[PDB]
Amino acid sequence: TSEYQTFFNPRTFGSGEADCGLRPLFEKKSLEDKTERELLESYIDGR
Amino acid sequence: SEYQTFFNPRTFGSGEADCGLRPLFEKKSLEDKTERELLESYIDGR
Amino acid sequence: DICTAKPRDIPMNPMCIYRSPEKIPEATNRRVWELSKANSRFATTFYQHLADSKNDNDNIFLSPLSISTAFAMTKLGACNDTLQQLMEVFKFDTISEKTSDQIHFFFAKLNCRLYRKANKASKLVSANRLFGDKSLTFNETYQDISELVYGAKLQPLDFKENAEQSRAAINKWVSNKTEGRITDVIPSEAINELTVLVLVNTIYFKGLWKSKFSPENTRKELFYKADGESCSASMMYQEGKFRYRRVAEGTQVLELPFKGDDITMVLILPKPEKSLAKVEKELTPEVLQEWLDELEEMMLCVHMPRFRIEDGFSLKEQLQDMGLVDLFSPEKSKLPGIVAEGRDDLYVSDAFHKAFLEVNEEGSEAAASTAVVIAGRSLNPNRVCFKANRPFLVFIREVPLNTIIFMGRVANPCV
Amino acid sequence: IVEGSDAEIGMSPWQVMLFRKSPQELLCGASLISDRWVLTAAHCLLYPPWDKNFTENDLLVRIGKHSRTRYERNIEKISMLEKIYIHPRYNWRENLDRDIALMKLKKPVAFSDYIHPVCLPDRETAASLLQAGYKGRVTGWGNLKETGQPSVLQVVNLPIVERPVCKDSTRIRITDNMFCAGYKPDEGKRGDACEGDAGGPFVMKSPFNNRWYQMGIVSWGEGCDRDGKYGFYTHVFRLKKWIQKVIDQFGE
Amino acid sequence: IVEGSDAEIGMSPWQVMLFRKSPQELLCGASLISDRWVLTAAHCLLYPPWDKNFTENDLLVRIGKHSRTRYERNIEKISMLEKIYIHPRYNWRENLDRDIALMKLKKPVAFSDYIHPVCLPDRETAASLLQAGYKGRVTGWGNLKETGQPSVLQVVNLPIVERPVCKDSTRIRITDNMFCAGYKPDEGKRGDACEGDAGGPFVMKSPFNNRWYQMGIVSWGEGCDRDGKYGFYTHVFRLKKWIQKVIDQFGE
Ligand SMILES: COC[C@H]1O[C@@H](O[C@H]2[C@H](OC)[C@@H](OC)[C@@H](O[C@H]3[C@H](OC)[C@@H](OC)[C@H](O[C@H]4[C@H](OS(=O)(=O)O)[C@@H](OS(=O)(=O)O)[C@@H](O[C@H]5[C@H](OC)[C@@H](OC)[C@H](O[C@H]6[C@H](OC)[C@@H](OS(=O)(=O)O)[C@@H](OC)O[C@@H]6COS(=O)(=O)O)O[C@H]5C(=O)O)O[C@@H]4COS(=O)(=O)O)O[C@@H]3C(=O)O)O[C@@H]2COS(=O)(=O)[O-])[C@H](OC)[C@@H](OC)[C@@H]1O[C@H]1O[C@H](COC)[C@@H](O[C@@H]2O[C@H](COC)[C@@H](O[C@H]3O[C@H](COC)[C@@H](O[C@@H]4O[C@H](COC)[C@@H](O[C@H]5O[C@H](COC)[C@@H](O[C@@H]6O[C@H](COC)[C@@H](O[C@H]7O[C@H](COS(=O)(=O)[O-])[C@@H](O[C@@H]8O[C@H](COS(=O)(=O)[O-])[C@@H](O[C@H]9O[C@H](COS(=O)(=O)O)[C@@H](O[C@H]%10O[C@H](COS(=O)(=O)O)[C@@H](OS(=O)(=O)O)[C@H](OS(=O)(=O)O)[C@H]%10OS(=O)(=O)O)[C@H](OS(=O)(=O)O)[C@H]9OS(=O)(=O)O)[C@H](OS(=O)(=O)[O-])[C@H]8OS(=O)(=O)[O-])[C@H](OC)[C@H]7OC)[C@H](OC)[C@H]6OC)[C@H](OC)[C@H]5OC)[C@H](OC)[C@H]4OC)[C@H](OC)[C@H]3OC)[C@H](OC)[C@H]2OC)[C@H](OC)[C@H]1OC
Ligand SMILES: *[C@@H]1O[C@H](CO)[C@@H](O[C@@H]2O[C@H](CO)[C@@H](O)[C@H](O)[C@H]2NC(C)=O)[C@H](O)[C@H]1NC(C)=O
Ligand SMILES: *[C@@H]1O[C@H](CO[C@@H]2O[C@@H](C)[C@@H](O)[C@@H](O)[C@@H]2O)[C@@H](O)[C@H](O)[C@H]1NC(C)=O
Ligand SMILES: *[C@H]1O[C@H](CO[C@@H]2O[C@@H](C)[C@@H](O)[C@@H](O)[C@@H]2O)[C@@H](O)[C@H](O)[C@H]1NC(C)=O
Numbered sequence A: 001t002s003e004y005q006t007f008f009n010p011r012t013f014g015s016g017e018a019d020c021g022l023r024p025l026f027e028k029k030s031l032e033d034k035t036e037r038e039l040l041e042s043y044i045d046g047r
Numbered sequence B: 001s002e003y004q005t006f007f008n009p010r011t012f013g014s015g016e017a018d019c020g021l022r023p024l025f026e027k028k029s030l031e032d033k034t035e036r037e038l039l040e041s042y043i044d045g046r
Numbered sequence C: 001d002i003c004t005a006k007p008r009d010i011p012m013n014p015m016c017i018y019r020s021p022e023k024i025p026e027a028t029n030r031r032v033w034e035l036s037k038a039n040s041r042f043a044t045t046f047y048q049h050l051a052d053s054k055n056d057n058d059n060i061f062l063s064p065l066s067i068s069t070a071f072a073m074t075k076l077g078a079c080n081d082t083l084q085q086l087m088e089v090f091k092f093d094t095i096s097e098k099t100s101d102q103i104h105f106f107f108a109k110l111n112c113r114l115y116r117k118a119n120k121a122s123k124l125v126s127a128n129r130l131f132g133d134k135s136l137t138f139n140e141t142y143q144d145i146s147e148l149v150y151g152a153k154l155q156p157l158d159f160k161e162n163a164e165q166s167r168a169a170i171n172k173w174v175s176n177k178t179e180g181r182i183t184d185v186i187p188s189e190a191i192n193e194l195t196v197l198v199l200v201n202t203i204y205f206k207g208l209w210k211s212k213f214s215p216e217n218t219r220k221e222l223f224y225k226a227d228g229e230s231c232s233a234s235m236m237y238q239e240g241k242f243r244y245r246r247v248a249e250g251t252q253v254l255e256l257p258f259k260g261d262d263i264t265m266v267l268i269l270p271k272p273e274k275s276l277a278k279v280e281k282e283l284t285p286e287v288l289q290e291w292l293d294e295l296e297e298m299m300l301c302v303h304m305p306r307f308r309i310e311d312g313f314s315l316k317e318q319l320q321d322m323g324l325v326d327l328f329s330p331e332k333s334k335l336p337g338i339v340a341e342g343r344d345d346l347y348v349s350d351a352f353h354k355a356f357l358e359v360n361e362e363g364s365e366a367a368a369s370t371a372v373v374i375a376g377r378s379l380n381p382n383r384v385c386f387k388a389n390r391p392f393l394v395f396i397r398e399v400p401l402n403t404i405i406f407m408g409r410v411a412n413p414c415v
Numbered sequence D, E: 001i002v003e004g005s006d007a008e009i010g011m012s013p014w015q016v017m018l019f020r021k022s023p024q025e026l027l028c029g030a031s032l033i034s035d036r037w038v039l040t041a042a043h044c045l046l047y048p049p050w051d052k053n054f055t056e057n058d059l060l061v062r063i064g065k066h067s068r069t070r071y072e073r074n075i076e077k078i079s080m081l082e083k084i085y086i087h088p089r090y091n092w093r094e095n096l097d098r099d100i101a102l103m104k105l106k107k108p109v110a111f112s113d114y115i116h117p118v119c120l121p122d123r124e125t126a127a128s129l130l131q132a133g134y135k136g137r138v139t140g141w142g143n144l145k146e147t148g149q150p151s152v153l154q155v156v157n158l159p160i161v162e163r164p165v166c167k168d169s170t171r172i173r174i175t176d177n178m179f180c181a182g183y184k185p186d187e188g189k190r191g192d193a194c195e196g197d198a199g200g201p202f203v204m205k206s207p208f209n210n211r212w213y214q215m216g217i218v219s220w221g222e223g224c225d226r227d228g229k230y231g232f233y234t235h236v237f238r239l240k241k242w243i244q245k246v247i248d249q250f251g252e
């Protein structure tokens, strides 16, 4: 699962923070967009 | 004495590493006349 | 502009006037004050009467101010017995002649003063209006006066041939005026071919408590109804300073202000022994007022249930049994000032009303989580609180006029 | 966005379009962080040099859009602004320092396949992801080149650049409240944000929880996609103290 | 200092005396945190109501002193100032919030038995030591009573007071950048800083590493040592961020 600790108070922030960053048409359907792999690959730390 | 520096002596100058220790007291294992009163104040009632 | 205008700034004067055989708030107009007092006498009377007509286990709710205000719109053009009944039922026959002759105008002033809050954590919203068949010819003087004093003119509709369509037209106006909240003041088939004149008076309050209840403290607890039974209700709780007072025969009075303090909710809770009914029979304008004066801030704990009450009763029926008869009679109705003649005489075919109150941890008409937790609240099991776990009375009032905007009874907040 | 490509549907559900009521025109990009709060660049709201000093009433936000020029019925949602909040330390005289602003929606927008908020980073995420060589993604309906406008939202991924390299790349005084991104000349590839994209989000996906975090706001640059030059973005985490303060006292 | 006592030699090696060149007069107290940096209170350098508006050139710092008036040969050391820096939000016109300032020395001072810098607290030391009940130490050459100068440096130990009690003791607004210390009206003992003591340090000895930390700067009060009143100090740790920024860009 996706672990995320909220920071704001929904009383003033409104709602949506708990499920922030997960796209209905992508993450939530276990689908990847055409270029996100490029971002994941950039975390490589060559030695 | 355990002390982690916070500043860069390049802009801070020297002295942070040995800060807070007095040549005539801590460095000579000597207490001043009233410091005992400060340590006693740290009692934490539960 | 009416809020700044004066009685003579715009010549009105009804077609008929009535005469009875026979510490005012600072920065407050005397006329408006006496008119607010009149509504308060109507409030108690209309309330006791409604309670006598229902089951002591039913919740009761109404906006006397809304009712008085709207019916005063008919006064403006009533004569003879029709007018006299209006004056006596709504207690208007108990005020000065000037205020009486200009009643409509002063209701406008009174209302201007009430809607000068909008501390958006305190919004009062209303929509009042009259609709008459378009076959009739309405007095234009009336219409103009209505335009200024009431905000709108009586809207002509075709009840005779376009009943359902006219229904939608009325609902639409209200759905817009209270934007979204009230979209069906007039229910299915309420308007029809025999419909000639309809009174529509709606109103609700949106406000936040100055001191909210913590959702974390609300627990499913028992509410001891009047029929002897008991049920589960989301009982809220909190500790804090509040204006309170233990009165005669052990009755308890508590005031919970909304953000702003110009509008509060007052609760009257009898002791387990004495029943609510007894209290209602003793509830007079001076009794209620004497109680409120006795209030003084105290640090205390409060157990109050979430509740939703509405005005589900027939206004016309209720008023008829109180004395307002002619206004509703096709034969005896006397409304010259709105439409003249005698072919088909003008009478009120229906008084559609809508007033409700939804109270939760956040306030009135405020959104809050339904989810009710189950955990320890670390409370003194031997605590002594204002525990409203049995039938109590509710008042929504405005300070400093003491105007009773809403009044009711919470007899069953369960389910 | 220069050298980017059409975004896919729902690819950036937190993408917000700032629109001017009169005359009707596209102003900037922005991002959704909740159902009632929207983030953007300060100069998109206040920038005398272009004689812009908007108030809540002059603006409007359109959410869940893809097409730049069409009204996407049943898909996009429009909201009025209740209040605008510009960073009190925003510097429009010199270098656009602290180029950030918050906008409260008059009425909460409803989330859908096309509308969903992005996450704001914490200290660890910021320290971990915001490093030279790691790539983020920028989106917007801005210009396609320095010297015209796309039909649909554009997207491009760019590597974070080392601070000393950002600093030596321009004579403009840069601050800790900004970071720069873009390919170096010796890297071959290119891409950049451009006029019209300001306010838009620079996002990164966390490999820890698979969530998208907004690390920056498109702010400024010198021309668009020039060699040896980099786009600059408002460092969001660095200004979180202000983001939290504003939301705490004006949110409810 | 009121109700205190003569300090021992080398007892407070970080205590600095701010001296005015013309006329020659003891102005305030201050503290040594390094061989080139001195800490003091903002209003000691800038307070128009007192016709005080100094620059580096009007001032002098005297480090390593014990006697108030007597010049101490080969013991004390007089240093000129290169530049002074007042907190940017300090506003003498409104109150004494952010009552803090830094002074850079013309040239580095040599340490000795009488000259040694004090430590500045980290977040943990701050949170742990700055608690109601715990006692700190205040040193100065200020007045001995509200209504009187000492021949040698004075010292007194005082307890930190709970914030709500600090706030209920005065009609003046208390900010998070201040804390108060002193004995309550029913504790029997007394003591307080006084006029001439401002700028001086309020230190505490860490039981963890045995080192002395400066938690506050003598700032203000209503009179001196009055019953039911408390002395007010600038909260050093809470303004540490600003201290770091000034040193980073003006220290080299
Ligand atoms: C008057 O009037 C009134 C009313 O009236 C009413 O009426 C009433 C009356 O009254 C009078 C009464 O009287 C009594 C009554 O009367 C009545 C009477 O009685 C008596 C009676 O008598 C009897 C009468 O009567 C009458 C009659 O009539 S009737 O009706 O009755 O009828 C007549 O008639 S006729 O017809 O004639 O006409 C008559 O009568 C009479 C007659 O003759 C004679 C006769 O003849 C013969 C008659 O005779 C008769 C008799 O009688 C007896 C009878 O009798 S019986 O019995 O029946 O009855 C008979 O015989 C038997 O008959 C006869 C005959 O008849 S016939 O019909 O036919 O003819 O009669 C006799 C009788 O009596 O009846 O005569 C009589 C008598 O007469 S005489 O005359 O002679 O008497 O009547 C009378 C009547 O009624 O009328 O009564 C009345 C009525 O009543 S009721 O009830 O009804 O209703 C009226 O009514 C009507 C009314 O209406 C009209 C009225 O009213 C109205 O009017 C009025 C007047 O006019 C006008 C009005 O009033 C008015 O009003 C107005 C308005 O109001 C509203 C007013 O005005 C005023 O007021 C207003 C209001 O106010 C409130 C105003 O306005 C306003 O204004 C304001 C101001 O403005 C200016 C506003 O406000 C707002 O807004 C504003 C703005 O603006 C623009 C705002 O403010 C603001 O605020 C702000 C804030 O503050 C606070 C500000 O801001 C500023 O400041 C601030 C503060 O400061 S301080 O110093 O303190 O602080 C700030 O903030 C701050 O900041 C800071 C910062 O800074 S900077 O520079 O920087 O930016 C902070 O700090 C912190 O920070 C931080 C952070 O940062 S960041 O950003 O960056 O984030 C820190 O720091 C630290 O950290 C950082 C960061 O870090 S981290 O790590 O995180 O990143 C750092 O940085 S870095 O870079 O480094 O990063 C740093 O460092 S450094 O180096 O840089 O530095 C650090 O440091 S450190 O040191 O610490 O280390 C921090 O924190 S932490 O956490 O840390 O601690 C910090 O610092 S520190 O240092 O401190 O530490 C801060 O925070 S903190 O907390 O901390 O502190 C902050 O603070 S805070 O607090 O804020 O938070 C800011 O910024 C800067 C600044 O800037 C912005 C501002 O500025 C200054 C300001 O502004 C300026 C405010 O607030 C908010 C707001 O508020 C709220 C407002 O709003 C807007 C406004 O409003 C809207 C105005 O002005 C305008 C004024 O004016 C003057 C006025 O005046 C007063 C008034 O006047 C009065 C009313 O209304 C009210 C109306 O309506 C109501
Ligand atoms: C829906 O309601 C709005 C107002 O609640 C009506 O529009 C307003 O009309 C008045 C005319 O007296 C203007 O002064 C306002 O500016 C208008 N809008 C605002 C800001 O309230 C509208 O006419 C209503 N529509 C219907 C269903 O009749
Ligand atoms: C932004 O807010 C105000 C501008 O609003 C109004 O329209 C402008 C064109 C001027 O005529 C102004 O006087 C009017 O109030 C200004 O008060 C404020 O200074 C503006 N900010 C800046 C610095 O441009
Ligand atoms: C005080 O410091 C400066 C004073 O410098 C100059 O000499 C004094 C005697 C005046 O003639 C003054 O006008 C001259 O500038 C001021 O520039 C500075 O603003 C003053 N500080 C404050 C905040 O009052």
Ligand SMILES: *[C@@H]1O[C@H](CO)[C@@H](O)[C@H](O)[C@H]1NC(C)=O
Residues within 6 Å of the ligand: C013, C014, C015, C138, C139, C140, C141, C142, C337, C340
């Ligand atoms: C209309 O009403 C006015 C006053 O209310 C009255 O003077 C007038 O006679 C009425 N007109 C009609 C339709 O008879």
